Amino acid sequence: VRILGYDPLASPALLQVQIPATPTSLETAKRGRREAIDIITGKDDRVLVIVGPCSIHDLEAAQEYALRLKKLSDELKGDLSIIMRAYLEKPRTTVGWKGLINDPDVNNTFNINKGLQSARQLFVNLTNIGLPIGSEMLDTISPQYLADLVSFGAIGARTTESQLHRELASGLSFPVGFKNGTDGTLNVAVDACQAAAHSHHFMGVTKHGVAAITTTKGNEHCFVILRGGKKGTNYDAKSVAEAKAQLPAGSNGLMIDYSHGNSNKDFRNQPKVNDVVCEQIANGENAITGVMIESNINEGNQGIKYGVSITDACIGWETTEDVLRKLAAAVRQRREVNK
Amino acid sequence: VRILGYDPLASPALLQVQIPATPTSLETAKRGRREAIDIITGKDDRVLVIVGPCSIHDLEAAQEYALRLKKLSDELKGDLSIIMRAYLEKPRTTVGWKGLINDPDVNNTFNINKGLQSARQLFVNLTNIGLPIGSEMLDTISPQYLADLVSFGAIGARTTESQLHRELASGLSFPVGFKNGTDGTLNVAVDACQAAAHSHHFMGVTKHGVAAITTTKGNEHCFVILRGGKKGTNYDAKSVAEAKAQLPAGSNGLMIDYSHGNSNKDFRNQPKVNDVVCEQIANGENAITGVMIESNINEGNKYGVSITDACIGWETTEDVLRKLAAAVRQRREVNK
C-alpha cells in the first residue's frame, strides 16, 4: 500500500566482477587498515587522519583532490596516516540529496544501480593510486558492495544508537568510528563500541543479493569520535579529559572531528579547532589518536561549480594543507615530550 | 574476516504459506489500523491504547493475557481503542536478549528461522481472536514477515534518528509512532515524522528474500510518542504544552508512554503517570490521542512475568484503563 514498487538490483557479487579491484586497490585498503589499527591501539604514535569532502558527487574532482592528498600524504607519512573521506551516503535531518549511491545523477531519478557502479568505480580509482579511503556506513546493505576497498568506516551521530549499525560494525573488517550523539554526549558512542565488540546474529544481505542469517565475530577496533552537539563542542582539553574519564578498560584512542558539531555552524572554525587540538597533542596528549576533517578542492558549498561541495561546507585545499602540516608538526612535538 | 558465516533463511513468502493469516486475523489488523487513524487524526474522540508486555517470550502466557485484554477492551470499546503490545524485538543499550525472533529459545542458540515462525504464529494467534497488535519496528527486514498482521508500528528512541528507520516507516501500511530521543527531547521525532511522510528510494529485502530497490509512498500517519529521557519525564502539562508547540500544523495527535523514561526506573510509576495524563485529558486536552502501557499478567520482571523490563500487573492494568476511559468521557463532556 505504501510501497509503490520494487526494481531489480544487481548483486554485490555481480557488481564486483563488473568493476574488479586492482591488486593495488586491494593492497592500499589492507595497508590502510593496519595503519589505522596500529594507531588507535597505541602501537604507532602517528595520528590517524580522515580527510576529504563532506560528500562525493563528482568522480573527476574527487580524483584530483585524491592526487593532491596522496602526495601531501607521502611527504607527511612519517607523522600522519591519512585516509580520504569518500562519503557516498549522507544522513539528512529530514530530506535532501542522500549521496552518490542513492541518486548519482543528483536529480531525483534515484538510479541506485548506477549509483553503486559509480561508488565502486570511484573507490577503485582512489585506492588504486595508493590512497586509503573511508566512508560513513549508513546503509546496512551497500557495504556488501564496497567493503573490500574501505579502510575505515564511520557510524553517524544519528545512527550510533541504532542496534542495526552496532550489529553492522561488529562484522566489518576494518576499524569503525562511532560519532558521539547529536546531543554532544559520549555515552551512546561508548555503548556502541562495547556492543560492536561482541558477536551478533541477525538477518542481512549476502554478496549474492539474498537475505541470510549472519553471525559476526565482534570488532575490537571501534573507537569514539568527538564531533560536538547540543551540549557544546568537545575538542578542548577539558572535554577530552572528561572523555578519557569515561572510556572503559581496553578502549582505543579518541578521534576528534574538526567539523560538524565542533566547527559549530561555521566551516571556517575547522583550522581553529586544529590549533586547539595540535595544542594538546604537542603537549603530550596521547589519547588523541585521530582527527576528522571535511576538506574539498575549494572551500564552502553550493546549491543544486567544480571543486565545491553540494552538501555541507568544507575548507579549501590550500587551508587543508596548512592544517595537516600544523598537525604533523604537533605530532613531532609529542614524540619529543614522550621521550 | 569478522563474518563468522551465514545460515539459510526462509523467505517472508515461504513463511506466509507455512503460517497463513486467518481472515479474522486480517480483518482484525485492518480494523485496528482504521481505528488508530481516526483517533490520531482527531476524527474519533477515543484514546488509542498500546498496552501489553515489554516483550513476548511465552506464547501461552501471551495468549492468556490477550484473552483478558480482549474482554476488557470489549467493555471499554466506547472510550478506548486497544492494541496489544506484541514486541518481538528489543533494542539493547549494549548487549542482551533482543527478543523472540532473534533467540526464541532465549538460550543463546539464535534460531532466527524458528524465531520468525513463533513470531508470526503469535501474531496470527492474537489477531485471530479479534485483538489488533503492535510491535517495535526495529529490524528493517523482519517486517516483511509480519507486517500483514500489524496495526501499529513503533520506532524506538534509539532509532528515531536513523534514516533507515525513517525510510522503513515511509513504506509501512499502518500508523507509526516515533519515540522522542533518549536525551528526552522531541526534535528528532518531529523531524522523523516529516521524513517518513515523504517517498523514499532504498535497497530492501522483498517477499522473495532477495534485495531490490524499493520506492515508498510516504506515511502521513506518523506521530510522536513522549517517553521521557535524560532531560526528564515529559508527560506533565508543561511538557505537553512544549511538545504541542513543536508540532507543525496538521500534525497527528501525541501519544504518551507511561513507561521507560517517564517511569523513572520504577514500573510502579506507570499508574501515577496515568493519573497525570487523565487529569489533562479530562480537563479537555485533545492533543493527547494515545497512551502506551507496559503491562503483563504479573508485575515486575516464573509464569506471567517479563524477562526484560518490569511491567505492571493485570489488576493494576485494569484499574489504569478503567480510569483512562473515564477521563475520555469527561473530556467528551468538556468538549461539549
Side-chain angles (χ1 to χ4, degrees), chain A residues 65-128:
Chain A
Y65 177 87
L67 271 305
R68 295 190 194 180
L69 186 61
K70 169 58 178 173
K71 52 77 61 181
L72 181 281
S73 178
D74 276 65
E75 160 176 43
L76 306 183
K77 72 177 177 181
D79 303 302
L80 307 174
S81 187
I82 301 167
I83 294 183
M84 183 182 150
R85 273 180 58 106
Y87 286 38
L88 306 305
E89 313 183 319
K90 310 297 303 181
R92 315 298 304 223
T93 297
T94 54
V95 296
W97 186 62
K98 298 179 183 178
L100 182 57
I101 291 174
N102 196 269
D103 190 28
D105 300 309
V106 306
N107 61 192
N108 290 296
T109 52
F110 309 85
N111 188 344
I112 292 181
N113 273 304
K114 185 186 170 180
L116 294 155
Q117 302 184 306
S118 301
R120 190 171 177 77
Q121 188 58 68
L122 169 76
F123 275 29
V124 305
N125 295 338
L126 299 176
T127 62
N128 176 247

Side-chain angles (χ1 to χ4, degrees), chain A residues 263-301:
Chain A
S263 69
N264 186 55
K265 304 178 177 181
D266 180 33
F267 78 81
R268 298 173 181 294
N269 297 323
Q270 283 197 63
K272 310 198 171 189
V273 176
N274 182 63
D275 294 325
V276 180
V277 172
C278 281
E279 167 81 55
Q280 300 171 62
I281 291 180
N283 291 318
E285 182 56 71
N286 288 303
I288 299 175
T289 59
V291 306
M292 189 178 273
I293 305 169
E294 289 196 300
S295 156
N296 209 316
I297 294 184
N298 301 306
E299 57 161 56
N301 59 336

Side-chain angles (χ1 to χ4, degrees), chain B residues 33-265:
Chain B
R33 306 179 191 175
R34 290 202 253 64
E35 278 180 43
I37 302 176
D38 290 321
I39 296 178
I40 73 167
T41 57
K43 306 266 276 193
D44 178 35
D45 59 17
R46 287 186 303 162
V47 166
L48 179 64
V49 184
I50 311 302
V51 51
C54 166
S55 68
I56 301 290
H57 65 68
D58 187 343
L59 275 65
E60 290 214 292
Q63 192 58 205
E64 194 193 316
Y65 178 103
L67 280 297
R68 291 185 189 175
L69 180 57
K70 173 59 180 185
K71 61 157 176 55
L72 183 52
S73 169
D74 265 20
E75 191 202 316
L76 306 176
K77 49 172 295 189
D79 322 307
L80 313 167
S81 184
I82 297 168
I83 291 177
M84 182 175 150
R85 271 180 58 103
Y87 286 39
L88 275 23
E89 326 178 320
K90 306 302 297 174
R92 289 297 168 172
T93 59
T94 55
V95 294
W97 189 63
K98 304 179 195 175
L100 180 70
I101 294 178
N102 199 270
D103 190 39
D105 298 310
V106 305
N107 54 14
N108 291 305
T109 51
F110 305 99
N111 194 337
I112 288 170
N113 275 300
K114 186 191 174 184
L116 296 160
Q117 304 178 316
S118 287
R120 186 164 175 86
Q121 190 54 249
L122 168 70
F123 280 26
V124 169
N125 283 177
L126 277 15
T127 56
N128 186 231
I129 62 166
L131 182 63
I133 57 176
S135 186
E136 182 186 324
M137 305 294 95
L138 172 44
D139 195 314
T140 55
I141 295 176
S142 64
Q144 282 301 321
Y145 297 74
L146 311 163
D148 54 309
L149 300 165
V150 181
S151 290
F152 163 78
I155 299 294
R158 301 169 192 68
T159 40
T160 284
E161 262 189 302
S162 170
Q163 181 158 281
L164 304 192
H165 283 77
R166 292 173 175 188
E167 303 174 324
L168 172 68
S170 74
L172 294 172
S173 309
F174 46 76
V176 171
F178 281 98
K179 294 292 200 74
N180 59 248
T182 57
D183 71 342
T185 65
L186 201 77
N187 307 56
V188 300
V190 175
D191 303 330
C193 287
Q194 311 309 303
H198 291 60
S199 169
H200 290 278
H201 292 273
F202 54 87
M203 298 177 273
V205 177
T206 67
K207 291 290 185 172
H208 311 309
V210 304
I213 298 164
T214 306
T215 300
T216 54
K217 168 182 166 60
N219 193 326
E220 76 273 29
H221 295 150
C222 295
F223 55 101
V224 176
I225 300 178
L226 302 183
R227 47 84 63 203
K230 279 151 60 177
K231 104 115 64 177
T233 58
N234 51 6
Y235 60 84
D236 58 273
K238 206 297 219 315
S239 301
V240 171
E242 307 185 313
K244 293 170 63 177
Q246 283 183 265
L247 292 174
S251 288
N252 292 311
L254 292 168
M255 173 175 273
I256 302 188
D257 188 350
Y258 288 9
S259 212
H260 306 102
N262 289 328
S263 171
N264 239 185
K265 305 184 181 186

Side-chain angles (χ1 to χ4, degrees), chain A residues 137-209:
Chain A
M137 304 295 118
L138 179 48
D139 191 327
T140 56
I141 293 173
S142 67
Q144 285 299 333
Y145 292 82
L146 318 151
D148 58 317
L149 302 165
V150 182
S151 289
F152 154 90
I155 300 302
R158 302 171 188 72
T159 35
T160 287
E161 266 186 298
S162 171
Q163 178 158 286
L164 305 192
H165 293 77
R166 291 167 175 194
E167 299 182 326
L168 176 82
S170 76
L172 295 182
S173 302
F174 45 76
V176 173
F178 290 91
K179 299 297 202 71
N180 55 246
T182 52
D183 75 327
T185 65
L186 293 36
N187 308 57
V188 298
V190 176
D191 302 329
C193 287
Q194 288 290 200
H198 292 254
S199 173
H200 294 272
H201 293 62
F202 57 83
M203 299 185 278
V205 179
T206 66
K207 283 182 175 45
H208 301 159

Side-chain angles (χ1 to χ4, degrees), chain A residues 51-57 65 85 87 90 258-260 263 265-271 293-302 307-320 323:
Chain A
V51 240
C54 161
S55 65
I56 268 60
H57 64 294
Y65 177 87
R85 273 180 58 106
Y87 286 38
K90 310 297 303 181
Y258 295 175
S259 197
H260 305 92
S263 69
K265 304 178 177 181
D266 180 33
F267 78 81
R268 298 173 181 294
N269 297 323
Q270 283 197 63
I293 305 169
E294 289 196 300
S295 156
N296 209 316
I297 294 184
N298 301 306
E299 57 161 56
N301 59 336
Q302 78 191 304
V308 177
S309 178
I310 60 170
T311 44
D312 287 352
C314 317
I315 53 175
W317 172 255
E318 330 304 321
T319 117
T320 295
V323 179

